[PDB]
Amino acid sequence: LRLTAEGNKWRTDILKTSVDTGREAAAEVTNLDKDTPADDPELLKRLQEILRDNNKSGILDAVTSSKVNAITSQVVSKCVPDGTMKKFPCNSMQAMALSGAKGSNVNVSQIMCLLGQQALEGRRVPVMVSGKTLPSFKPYETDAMAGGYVKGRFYSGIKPQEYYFHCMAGREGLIDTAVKTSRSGYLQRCLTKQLE
Amino acid sequence: SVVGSLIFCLDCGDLLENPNAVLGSNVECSQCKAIYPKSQFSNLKVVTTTADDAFPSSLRAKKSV
Amino acid sequence: GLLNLGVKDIGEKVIFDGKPSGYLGNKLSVSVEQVSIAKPMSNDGVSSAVERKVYPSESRQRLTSYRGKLLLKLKWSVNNGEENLFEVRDCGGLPVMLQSNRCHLNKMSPYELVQHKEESDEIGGYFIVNGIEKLIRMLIVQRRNHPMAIIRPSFANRGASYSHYGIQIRSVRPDQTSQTNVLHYLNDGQVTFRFSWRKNEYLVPVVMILKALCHTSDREIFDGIIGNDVKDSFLTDRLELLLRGFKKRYPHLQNRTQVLQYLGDKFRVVFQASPDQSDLEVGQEVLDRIVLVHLGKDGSQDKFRMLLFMIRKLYSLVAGECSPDNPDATQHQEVLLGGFLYGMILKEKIDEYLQNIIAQVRMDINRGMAINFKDKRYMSRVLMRVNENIGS
Amino acid sequence: VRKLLPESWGFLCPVHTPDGSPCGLLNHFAHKCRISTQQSDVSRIPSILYSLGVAPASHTFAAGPSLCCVQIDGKIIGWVSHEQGKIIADTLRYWKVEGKTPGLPIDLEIGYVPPSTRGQYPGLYLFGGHSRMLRPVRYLPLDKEDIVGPFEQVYMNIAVTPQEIQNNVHTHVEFTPTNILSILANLTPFSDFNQSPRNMYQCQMGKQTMGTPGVALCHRSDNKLYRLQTGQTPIVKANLYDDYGMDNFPNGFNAVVAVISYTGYDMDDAMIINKSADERGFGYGT
Amino acid sequence: SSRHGQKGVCSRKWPTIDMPFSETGIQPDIIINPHAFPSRMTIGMFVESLAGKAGAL
Amino acid sequence: KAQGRTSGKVPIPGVKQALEKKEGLFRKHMMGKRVNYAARSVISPDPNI
Amino acid sequence: MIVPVRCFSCGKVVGDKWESYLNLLQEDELDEGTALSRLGLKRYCCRRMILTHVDLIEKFLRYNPLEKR
Amino acid sequence: IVMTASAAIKTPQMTLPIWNDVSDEQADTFCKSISKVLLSEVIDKVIVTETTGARSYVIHMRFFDNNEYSEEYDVSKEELQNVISNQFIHLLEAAIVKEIKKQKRVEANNNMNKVQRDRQSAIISHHRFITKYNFDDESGKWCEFKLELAADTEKLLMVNIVEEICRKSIIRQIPHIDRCVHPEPENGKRVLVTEGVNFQAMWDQEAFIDVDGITSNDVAAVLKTYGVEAARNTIVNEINNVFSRYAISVSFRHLDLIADMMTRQGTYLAFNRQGMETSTSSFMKMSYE
Amino acid sequence: ESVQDQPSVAVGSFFKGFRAPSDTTFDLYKKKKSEKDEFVLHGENERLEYEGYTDSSSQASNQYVVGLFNPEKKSIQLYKAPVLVSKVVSKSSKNLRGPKIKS
Amino acid sequence: SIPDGFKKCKHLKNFPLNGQQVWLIKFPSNVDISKLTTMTIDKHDYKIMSNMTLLVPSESKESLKIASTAPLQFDKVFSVSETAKIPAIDYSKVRVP
DNA sequence: CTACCGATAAGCAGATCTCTCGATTGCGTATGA
DNA sequence: TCATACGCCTCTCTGCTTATCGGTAG
RNA sequence: UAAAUCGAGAG
């Protein structure tokens, strides 16, 4: 599961460029000019209206999710295959992912390089009524870190806020998994009763 | 006593009946029975405008922001 | 204690007998003023003397419950203090819980706990019933004493009010018992108070209670709901609609006394009242028993002010001036402790016990007995003819 | 209803929940969440508020969200401006944290909602009643412990670690980040390295283990008991494992594990246990 | 099960002789397939194994 | 279709209620029955069969 | 409960070493590692058996049904 | 699709294939022409003035700027005035009289032209209790009309009913059509999609839309207007495109059998008791439910 | 420059812009307490009854002071006046009631 | 209707109003009235910066009358608000690495 | 003019895999002891 | 005085079905 | 040997 020194250097250098991605995405969504400060009163007001509404929030979440997904794709592409301390076939994780024995490249990426952005239902993490995603974060925080985009990995561990966001995502996943099995049963039963 | 369409009694503070539904030329309070002549208040004018979130239109988004 | 506050706020339940005595013969006013639970003890057969001490280890081994005696003293009052007959009546063994103040392990050190066969670090918080451990699970309920702007389609859908807005408040009496008030909204420009005294629900115009709580003028209501917001045409129009609707529907109620009388004779059968309570008295009773209980009796001015605040909040909500409060967000939630539920159930069981003895007296009235309320023999005869197993 | 809201930060455990039908509904409390069970002394609070600039509610002529309605457990105490209400909220929190004012109990929750645009209804809300939810956090001024609740928390900035405190932003900080987790979630070793659907599986499964229920089993008549004959304290364990005195009830054993594909009798989830170890008492129970 | 939600029924009582012995002579008392880890990503188990080995040493 | 219930404990199911729902006679006793000569247990792997 | 007689992984007898380990910890100021090394437990499989033992038997013995408390 | 035979599906649309010779220009214009526009979509605000000096009601219908709304929605000031004077007041008076029945249980208007005065008098005669009417015949920016009413009635909101009337008023709409967006072509297919099903409307627009390849998401409308076999084809296509989007392959024999069973009577049947009773064997239905 | 703790004036609160004829007059009361005494203001007229109280839950926590100020001098004459919350009842409507019990 | 102990005040001091600005100062009970914005009084800091109806003694100085000219409202209103000290944290000892 | 025929508005009825444990079972009353 | 038998003792979807307000011919 | 309700679980 380890990386090389140069692989970690690449990963951290690319992740350093994700600091302003959230602010730029928010500014683009609110139609504000780029390079605007993250604490601009007009930007804060526009994000306030976006949070109050439910469609502007969805648009902003989709745009920021696309940006952070581009960032994580860059990180994974540059680091996963040619940054590992052990290479295939010596790397058992990589061999298992590539040969289809168990797991996949997304699992290997989450373990080794980046855990990506947490999506609850095609959307970022929920927001309080005060514009705060968590007590640890500013109101109307224009930061990908305070949007569910966790920069940690399961090899080096995840910070507390990232842990909370990932717990949210896991809970939604388990709820949907529980629901779908009961959902399909009535459809199958009616189909087979008529077509038996 | 008079703020909008409402008329209040300056003595007790009860809603006086609408002057357009009384005998005429005067209306009295239903509690103090004080004399309120129909003069001194004839323009019961209210101005109201719809909320900003009442007419969601495509041009509404583009006119601002 | 919560139990003492509950029996104090229960009040006295009154019955009459036919013995010509303005209303019906003499008066009986049964009430409870002290509920005491004792630590569990064993009679050891009939030996008695100094009672033995029971322990949870003994309860577990015997495969029975671990309960202590429950004591209530009845204030058998005849003709409003003419002749009072106090009597402490046991009500069976109330299951007590471990490590509580009414348990025998309340302050025992770990060495003593090991000596008494419990555990090195035994923790209570549970009841032993029929030799089987049990626990009253903590439940999440609405936050007390807070009016929350709530938007719900289930209001207009199958609601007597026609809107999906409202302002719900779950007030709790000082004896830890809840009574919720829903400030519904109507599409035609008025607000209807809603509550559920018994298992059924009732609706009352809000301005009714607004005038009934304290002596008020219509200008006072306008001031309370609109503070310097004279230019707010929305608020002024809604307030005018509400006041005109009240004056049109109830032109007779020009005074607090007669609006209270109307409330009283509207709520007379359900709020069980003897043929002694006047309409004004029973109206004040239902007012103190239903609307804004968390401010308690003798808080009519505070109830009036808080009702004005609730109305302003509802109008601001329907005007889009404030977001709805999420019922399921933990920000707007509290937890029912589990012992408070025990207190509520004890208060209701005491109420049912008092109503049962009064029903026995009424059955005696319907039949033909000596029915002398001043006779200790008759009082003990009617007290032994009613089930008293509150502990059971 | 089952969504993990961010308003449960430090009150409800994000991990501790039973996967399946009761998921999200049967949650558990954080191990440091104190539930108030008594009514705090709120007699002197109205007297303090009036001195701080609150106009009396009896004679105020004020209404609407444009004014900060100060309440105490559901009683309208007075009215004040929004900025003044914020100042009173901060001053009340300071006086509550510091141990000099007699009228203000530390358990009192000062919930303040500043004005916004179509936000929550504003006003200064004070609570001291029973059944409240309380959590200890470190008030950054005076470095002293403070008590907050869910209603007051969602409007206040609280850094998760002392290294992330920002200038003029954070006024509180968690004592440790690990007090937002429940028991059986703090006890999971290296819980920040697993997928969350595995931390929650471990939380659900730590209750089903055949450990030791108690030591007084000779004086109990329980219908069914699951006893582990020989348990061991973990080599790797959280600092809270001995804080709660959990070594009195060992739950399992330390086994020499080999992450190896050798036997061929374990692909999906199966496991292979040494025969000789089993014959030596490994994992025995009654 | 382990402390990271790794379920699994015991499959066979593998005799000690057939168990893969190490250089020091330690024959593990529990074998867990390496394929269980990539999908669940329970790296906490990997950290815990070596941390416990260092602690026991 | 029964009329008359003040408090009660449980309303006795009619003959119709014995044949109607998922727990009724049809879906529980002819569309699926408990079977003789059948076992059930936990599965463990075996690459040698 | 009481100390296992044999180490699970290999089979070395560690049932005669719990009291010695406790004495080495109490009387002398020996660390757990040094005490285990002195006892003769070189492999970590043997070391864990005495290092992580709980000894719940002492807690169990306080509940004696055949002696007056 | 399969288990309820929803004739009122949540999201009905058609696929309109544009001709190969029509560019994006004259296509977006066609979309704006076919899309539905409401009266509320163009009103900036309304300023209701109530006076009892008998119960008058002066409504000032502020409008969006002409140079932008006539380009966004392709609706002219003449059409705006026509729809107002023909439907807006007609609905407003009906709502007002219904409210009364239930209860009982910019400044240049003085400088006016002869044509405008005649129009105002005509609309006053046409409608019930309107005392004045004017329109911005040179800018299309406002439309005032007094609404003097009887003084015996109580106070009325006159704002939350004007909101509803504006939102329910139709400026230019074809039945069962809401919006017509122009999505990016999938693979060489110039596709125009709508938000509703009404085939006969697009049959007239042969110049822009190739009427032969009009395929709709809805099945009941396809069955009603094209026949049973087209309904079976669209059933198969809809039940397949959901699987394809989820990267799951189901052989078309299964979907063909399902569609043929669903349209075995020439009607859009379903797999429920309401589409089950037509069966020879009764025990099967009794065992079903 | 000179405070007057002794009862000189008092300020009431009926509603916004409460106006009464100049012939109307009120009477003041004073309980026999030590500090922060409760005040009751009484009055009557031809057909209206005027009354007021002071809320003890707030009158003992804050003080209200009236005063003057010269335009060219800082000489301020302090005057302490309590605040009374008041209500207005019509004399004819004050005795208005109904039947005790409706049979 | 005289409540118990609420004796009618025999006499009241004259309250001059003609001859001119009328202000209200909502002094907290803690502030000493006898001894007399960043004003400093006693040993604590304070913030100083038609609602009610005013009454004035009549000629008989045994009753209350509403003051008016030829009504009269207070020219200015002040509320002495008690303030505390909120000190900035020491970031050097707060942000421990 | 007025009856047959429709076109909503409202209410009504019926729906929304197996397996293992454990616990529990009513008041209310009224007359022969 | 007092026990066991008799008498009861509040936030989802699809249709179908009935009643009631409009219209056309005779 | 039953039958219903509630509670706790496994896949």
Ligand SMILES: [Zn+2]
């Ligand atoms: Zn009056």
Ligand SMILES: [Zn+2]
């Ligand atoms: Zn060994």
